[PDB]
Amino acid sequence: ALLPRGHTQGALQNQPSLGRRYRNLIVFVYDGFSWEDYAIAQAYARRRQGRVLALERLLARYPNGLINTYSLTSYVTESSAAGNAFSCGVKTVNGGLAIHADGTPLKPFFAAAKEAGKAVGLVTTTTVTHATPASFVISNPDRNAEERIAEQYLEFGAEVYLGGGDRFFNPARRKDGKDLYAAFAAKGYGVVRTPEELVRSNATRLLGVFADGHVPYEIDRRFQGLGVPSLKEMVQAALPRLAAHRGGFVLQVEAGRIDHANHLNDAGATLWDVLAADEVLELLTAFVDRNPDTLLIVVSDHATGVGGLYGAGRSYLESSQGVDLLEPQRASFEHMLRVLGQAPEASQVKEAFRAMKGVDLEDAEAERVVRAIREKVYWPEGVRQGVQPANTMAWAMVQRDAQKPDRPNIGWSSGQHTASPVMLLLYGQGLRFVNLGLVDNTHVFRLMGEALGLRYQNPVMSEEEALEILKAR
Amino acid sequence: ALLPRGHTQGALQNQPSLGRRYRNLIVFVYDGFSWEDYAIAQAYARRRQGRVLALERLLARYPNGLINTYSLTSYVTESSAAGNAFSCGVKTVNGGLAIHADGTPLKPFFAAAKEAGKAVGLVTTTTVTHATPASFVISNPDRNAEERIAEQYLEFGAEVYLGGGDRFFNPARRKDGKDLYAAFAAKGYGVVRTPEELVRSNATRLLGVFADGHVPYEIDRRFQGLGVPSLKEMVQAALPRLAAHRGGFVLQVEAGRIDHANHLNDAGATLWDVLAADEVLELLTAFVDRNPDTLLIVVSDHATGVGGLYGAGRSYLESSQGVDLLEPQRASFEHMLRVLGQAPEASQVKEAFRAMKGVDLEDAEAERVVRAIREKVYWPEGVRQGVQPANTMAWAMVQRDAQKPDRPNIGWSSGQHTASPVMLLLYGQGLRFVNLGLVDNTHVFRLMGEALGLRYQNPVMSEEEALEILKAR
Numbered sequence: 038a039l040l041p042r043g044h045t046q047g048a049l050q051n052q053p054s055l056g057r058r059y060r061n062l063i064v065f066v067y068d069g070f071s072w073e074d075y076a077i078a079q080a081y082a083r084r085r086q087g088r089v090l091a092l093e094r095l096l097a098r099y100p101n102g103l104i105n106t107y108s109l110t111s112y113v114t115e116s117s118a119a120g121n122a123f124s125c126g127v128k129t130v131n132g133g134l135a136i137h138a139d140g141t142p143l144k145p146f147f148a149a150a151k152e153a154g155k156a157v158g159l160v161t162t163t164t165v166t167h168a169t170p171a172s173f174v175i176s177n178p179d180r181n182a183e184e185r186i187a188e189q190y191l192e193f194g195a196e197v198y199l200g201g202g203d204r205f206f207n208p209a210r211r212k213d214g215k216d217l218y219a220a221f222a223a224k225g226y227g228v229v230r231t232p233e234e235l236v237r238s239n240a241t242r243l244l245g246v247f248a249d250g251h252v253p254y255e256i257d258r259r260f261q262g263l264g265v266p267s268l269k270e271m272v273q274a275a276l277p278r279l280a281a282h283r284g285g286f287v288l289q290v291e292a293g294r295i296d297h298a299n300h301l302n303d304a305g306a307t308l309w310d311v312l313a314a315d316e317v318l319e320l321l322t323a324f325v326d327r328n329p330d331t332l333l334i335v336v337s338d339h340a341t342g343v344g345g346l347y348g349a350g351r352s353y354l355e356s357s358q359g360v361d362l363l364e365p366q367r368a369s370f371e372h373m374l375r376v377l378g379q380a381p382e383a384s385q386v387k388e389a390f391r392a393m394k395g396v397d398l399e400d401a402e403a404e405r406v407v408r409a410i411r412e413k414v415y416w417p418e419g420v421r422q423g424v425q426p427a428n429t430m431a432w433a434m435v436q437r438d439a440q441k442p443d444r445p446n447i448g449w450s451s452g453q454h455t456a457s458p459v460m461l462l463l464y465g466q467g468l469r470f471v472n473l474g475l476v477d478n479t480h481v482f483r484l485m486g487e488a489l490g491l492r493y494q495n496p497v498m499s500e501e502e503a504l505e506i507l508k509a510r
Numbered sequence: 511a512l513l514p515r516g517h518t519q520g521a522l523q524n525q526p527s528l529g530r531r532y533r534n535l536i537v538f539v540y541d542g543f544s545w546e547d548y549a550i551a552q553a554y555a556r557r558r559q560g561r562v563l564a565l566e567r568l569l570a571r572y573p574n575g576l577i578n579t580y581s582l583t584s585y586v587t588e589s590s591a592a593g594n595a596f597s598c599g600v601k602t603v604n605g606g607l608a609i610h611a612d613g614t615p616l617k618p619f620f621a622a623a624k625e626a627g628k629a630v631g632l633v634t635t636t637t638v639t640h641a642t643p644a645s646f647v648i649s650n651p652d653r654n655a656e657e658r659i660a661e662q663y664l665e666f667g668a669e670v671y672l673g674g675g676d677r678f679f680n681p682a683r684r685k686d687g688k689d690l691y692a693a694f695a696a697k698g699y700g701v702v703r704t705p706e707e708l709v710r711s712n713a714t715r716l717l718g719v720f721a722d723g724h725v726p727y728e729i730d731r732r733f734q735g736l737g738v739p740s741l742k743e744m745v746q747a748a749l750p751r752l753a754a755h756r757g758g759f760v761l762q763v764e765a766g767r768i769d770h771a772n773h774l775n776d777a778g779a780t781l782w783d784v785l786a787a788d789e790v791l792e793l794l795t796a797f798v799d800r801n802p803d804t805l806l807i808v809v810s811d812h813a814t815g816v817g818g819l820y821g822a823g824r825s826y827l828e829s830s831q832g833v834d835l836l837e838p839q840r841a842s843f844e845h846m847l848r849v850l851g852q853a854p855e856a857s858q859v860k861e862a863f864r865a866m867k868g869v870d871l872e873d874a875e876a877e878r879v880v881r882a883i884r885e886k887v888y889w890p891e892g893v894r895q896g897v898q899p900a901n902t903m904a905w906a907m908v909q910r911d912a913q914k915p916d917r918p919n920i921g922w923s924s925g926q927h928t929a930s931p932v933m934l935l936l937y938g939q940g941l942r943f944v945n946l947g948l949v950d951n952t953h954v955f956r957l958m959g960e961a962l963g964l965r966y967q968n969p970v971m972s973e974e975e976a977l978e979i980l981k982a983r
């Protein structure tokens with residue numbers, strides 16, 4: 038009940054300074070992004086697109102390090118506690134937004150920024166009310182109360198909100214039947230619901246909601262013709278609006294479905310959301326190049342999966358085949374499941390894998406998929422592989438040819454988040470002497486506060502205090 | 511033949527300088543060590559041992575970054591090409607030691623160091639002739655020809671060789687029946703085969719070989735009472751011998767069985783070899799603190815597995831249980847398989863898991879192990895989980911209680927190496943301004959050459975050339 042021997046030299050006390058001040062702050066969260074994902078996308082860009090990934094160029098030149106992602110009582114965080122660490126500077130229990138397990142509210146960073154006259158933008162491929170954007174602006178004991186969070190967004194009044202989640206705004210979907218779109222319009226927001234409307238809009242403040250739930254994966258947008266915006270298209274609309282504001286601005290961009298694809302154990306969906314993020318990176322760095330008063334932070338909130346390209350063949354000499362084998366993919370497991378519906382036949386499964394993964398399943402493999410979808414019978418199991426039926430789908434298309442991968446030699450530790458430290462990267466003018474090393478995720482809060490002159494403190498709870506509360510729940 | 515678009519900004523062209531010069535050099539390789547391994551050990555030290563891992567303290571303070579580990583024709587390397595990148599500064603085809611795929615020999619760095627008058631030590635928990643040490647000193651087209659490597663070690667003449675591999679020196683074990691211990695003794699080497707002999711010896715130069723193959727895992731040494739040295743004990747014998755040499759010294763220390771544990775999918779065995787490495791780290795950094803003419807490089811050669819502590823329980827709130835569930839473990843899967851012999855009964859499998867992993871196997875789980883050991887029937891399969899029967903043993907003790915882990919909630923992407931970039935850390939005097947970022951693993955060669963003023967070059971082979979050669983095999 039006091040600190041481990043050596044605490045004065047641990048990662049928590051590693052609090053490196055920027056040594057620079059800024060007027061604008063962009064925070065680009067790669068949700069669920071692991072170093073295995075990085076390696077696959079890095080290789081894919083070079084080998085299959087003959088290009089160097091923009092993220093590789095940044096990690097090869099600009100200050101970067103590592104964050105610990107553990108939450109207050111668990112060595113594996115989820116998104117609200119991770120976002121809270123960023124936005125509030127303190128460890129919380131998994132589950133609440135800018136709040137402690139006892140209900141103590143915290144003040145998150147973009148709320149502080151708005152109070153200081155910065156415009157605020159939230160842009161994501163998740164529901165716009167999801168944990169990562171929401172943890173930066175509002176407090177709520179239940180991350181999943183997104184119908185209420187949408188109301189909190191209206192009252193908070195950020196200049197730009199872009200993402201998914203029509204189910205939380207549309208009077209025909211909300212449980213209370215309220216037309217929140219109308220209420221945003223009454224406060225002067227331009228409301229947009231398609232890519233076309235988004236780009237055409239000349240409204241200064243924007244609410245854009247482009248899907249019932251999360252925005253589709255890049256792989257599905259790209260190859261299945263879905264009329265939804267890319268993350269890039271959403272940033273292109275937000276950035277000039279925020280930049281026009283006299284008092285400066287803060288923006289969160291979230292590549293929020295990297296996490297989701299990693300949950301499915303779908304390496305091809307992960308890759309395309311990482312590649313979609315890379316296009317955004319190019320946009321954001323070009324903006325910072327033109328705007329040296331602006332700091333860009335690129336950070337993963339935790340690892341998920343993790344989905345590693347693994348050694349294949351004699352002396353692992355065939356390991357790169359798994360990268361090639363991603364290029365034929367044309368849809369995610371999520372879209373496949375949608376296509377297949379609730380009572381697919383083995384023959385239909387087999388065709389879906391052929392058409393959308395480039396995979397020729399054996400009878401017994403397609404049958405496993407049928408059982409998982411129809412009878413909730415999972416293979417090999419459903420605890421370590423806790424996301425179903427997608428994880429059974431991944432195992433159904435496992436590599437069989439040990440001499441040379443016939444299907445991607447990418448495996449998965451789990452269908453859940455992992456405890457690995459993950460990427461933290463700074464892109465800005467004058468940071469050459471910043472040495473990050475391994476810091477705590479709460480240090481992202483300190484960096485944001487230093488950059489903008491918005492350092493303040495939020496209350497702390499000890500691990501033992503939190504465990505007692507959790508015992509009593 | 512042409513380089514990818516953006517190659518001038520890639521990680522290969524990130525070649526940061528030490529800006530300091532040294533007399534001695536210690537290279538500490540964590541073989542197969544991933545960021546998931548790191549998170550588990552970091553958590554175990556704090557939560558179960560009440561202390562901050564020395565490696566945590568180092569990453570929280572001294573310059574560290576990442577290395578890309580891919581080899582010349584594969585995005586997943588093995589240990590010989592990884593070592594060559596370090597010791598020779600060029601990419602090679604997996605399998606050869608300090609040699610290209612067409613038989614072109616390369617000059618590895620410790621050979622250059624000896625030519626320049628440095629004493630040389632190799633200390634490892636693998637067989638002393640294994641790829642990571644051997645790649646720093648000798649050339650050989652086949653990393654597996656360790657009987658010949660042992661002969662090459664005789665002419666190389668390193669001041670200290672310590673590790674496993676009696677099968678490669680013992681006249682009763684070598685195919686050619688030749689008594690290499692006698693040959694090393696003839697050259698003035700003290701020969702030691704046990705920890706007591708090692709500590710008692712006053713020989714200036716040392717050959718110490720402590721097991722028939724690899725040295726036992728730390729967990730087995732520690733709890734099964736085996737009479738073999740720890741990595742620390744081996745380093746304690748080597749370091750003062752090397753430090754006495756007037757011309758300075760180079761030393762490789764290898765925590766070489768982190769890799770093997772991750773291959774097994776045995777998280778408890780991985781933990782204890784990481785912790786054993788951590789004790790050595792404390793020893794090496796104290797040596798550097800007293801000898802500022804000495805640089806310490808700490809580096810993983812690639813990730814293996816990988817074995818991630820994953821989200822378990824409601825809101826992942828029970829995920830730290832897996833860390834706790836490691837403390838009752840008392841042996842590795844390798845030691846357990848030794849005990850179980852070739853025709854175990856389920857009841858004996860069930861007893862081994864109880865006594866050595868603290869796991870209560872169901873009847874069906876115990877039977878899967880028997881079938882794996884006796885019939886080479888593997889579950890769930892044997893390709894993604896390519897290390898058997900150990901990977902089946904891991905799956906036999908998978909977590910079953912989804913509300914709160916009853917066995918460690920640690921999962922594995924595979925039984926093989928992965929593509930993920932890994933740790934590179936510098937511990938020395940005067941490096942506060944070194945910003946590493948993501949570099950190629952071949953940069954370790956440039957760092958060693960800079961450190962000692964021994965820069966030279968080895969010939970490069972192109973990926974196209976290499977692929978041609980491999981075709982024609």
Ligand SMILES: [Mg+2]
Nearest residue numbers: 068116169293
């Ligand atoms: Mg998120």
Ligand SMILES: [Mg+2]
Nearest residue numbers: 541589642766
């Ligand atoms: Mg090794």
Ligand SMILES: [Zn+2]
Nearest residue numbers: 068069116338
């Ligand atoms: Zn997340």
Ligand SMILES: [Zn+2]
Nearest residue numbers: 069296297341
């Ligand atoms: Zn998640």
Ligand SMILES: [Zn+2]
Nearest residue numbers: 541542589811
């Ligand atoms: Zn290795």
Ligand SMILES: [Zn+2]
Nearest residue numbers: 542769773814
């Ligand atoms: Zn290995």
